[PDB]
Amino acid sequence: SPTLTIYSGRGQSLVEPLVKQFEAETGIRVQVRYSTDAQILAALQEEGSRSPADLFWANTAGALGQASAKGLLRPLGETLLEKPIAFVPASRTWVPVTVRLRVLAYNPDRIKAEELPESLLDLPRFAREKGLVGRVGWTPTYSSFQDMVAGMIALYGEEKTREWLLAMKALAPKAYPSNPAMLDAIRAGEVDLGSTNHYYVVRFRRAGYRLGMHHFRDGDAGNLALVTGAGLLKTSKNLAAATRFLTYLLSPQAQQYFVGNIGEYPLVKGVALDPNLLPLEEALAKSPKLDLEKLPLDRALRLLRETGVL
Numbered sequence: 001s002p003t004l005t006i007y008s009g010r011g012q013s014l015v016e017p018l019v020k021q022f023e024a025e026t027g028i029r030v031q032v033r034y035s036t037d038a039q040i041l042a043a044l045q046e047e048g049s050r051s052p053a054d055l056f057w058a059n060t061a062g063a064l065g066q067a068s069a070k071g072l073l074r075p076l077g078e079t080l081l082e083k084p085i086a087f088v089p090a091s092r093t094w095v096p097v098t099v100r101l102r103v104l105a106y107n108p109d110r111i112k113a114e115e116l117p118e119s120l121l122d123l124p125r126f127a128r129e130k131g132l133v134g135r136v137g138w139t140p141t142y143s144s145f146q147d148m149v150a151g152m153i154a155l156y157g158e159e160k161t162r163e164w165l166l167a168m169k170a171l172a173p174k175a176y177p178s179n180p181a182m183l184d185a186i187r188a189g190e191v192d193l194g195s196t197n198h199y200y201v202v203r204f205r206r207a208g209y210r211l212g213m214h215h216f217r218d219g220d221a222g223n224l225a226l227v228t229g230a231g232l233l234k235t236s237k238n239l240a241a242a243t244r245f246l247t248y249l250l251s252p253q254a255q256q257y258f259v260g261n262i263g264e265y266p267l268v269k270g271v272a273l274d275p276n277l278l279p280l281e282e283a284l285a286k287s288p289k290l291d292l293e294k295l296p297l298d299r300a301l302r303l304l305r306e307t308g309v310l
Helices: 012-026 037-050 061-069 120-129 143-156 158-169 179-188 198-206 239-249 252-262 280-286 297-306
Strands: 003-008 029-034 055-058 095-106 136-138 193-197 212-214 225-232
Touching (some): 003 012, 003 239, 012 252, 055 061, 095 143, 095 179, 095 239, 095 252, 136 179, 143 193, 143 297, 158 297, 179 193, 179 198
Parallel strands (some): 003 029, 003 055
Antiparallel strands (some): 055 225, 095 225
């Protein structure tokens, strides 16, 4: 009888199995609307008080940060917010659910782990010295790559970041429409290395492909933490169910699904970790300690276009 409406910037293949389970166990009917974080935000603002949405389940902390600044999200209580091990916003207006890391994927047949640079800023120099012109991959249109560039701006400033983009560009990189395309090219020997999200490498490894995964020095922009999460909209007329659903996402079983089915890092204990993941404390220490709700994404896209990468 009760009904719950979720606006999701997370992919249907990821979301649907969990919502189906939630429905089966609670008897609560769930309707999900799928889009990008950006146009969900736009939609909610356009719909205003007339919105049927109870929850915004987002792919990025940045988008939840935007929703919160726009006044769309309810403050949350301590019983829920104390569950995740990290990444709870100061605003207390959403709950982090998983984290993912930027990493450097590489072909072990052509690249020695010991050899790779400790900082992303030194990548182009490495690529030059190793003669990898035409043999570096990247995904300029991919959300998380754009976040990573935004983190570089926050951390190093625009000039330094522009110098990095132009140095990368001078490597004659190959651009890929998606991360699996790029990792396939790595597999194939078309490129030797490329920055990606850790779970893509996990998925390839699980399929039998032994791609290298390189982490930069703790705090380096190349290890940017990519936080997902969900928030309860003020327009919700189903508060108990919506809160029940948020709680469910942080449950050990659902968190095991994120680790197993999806390959992402969980934000709670009580789960079995894939051997391809760092211990959680190490994973958590990799990223720069940035305000993840304030990444200068707009500045990032701009630099990416100015430099002619996008």
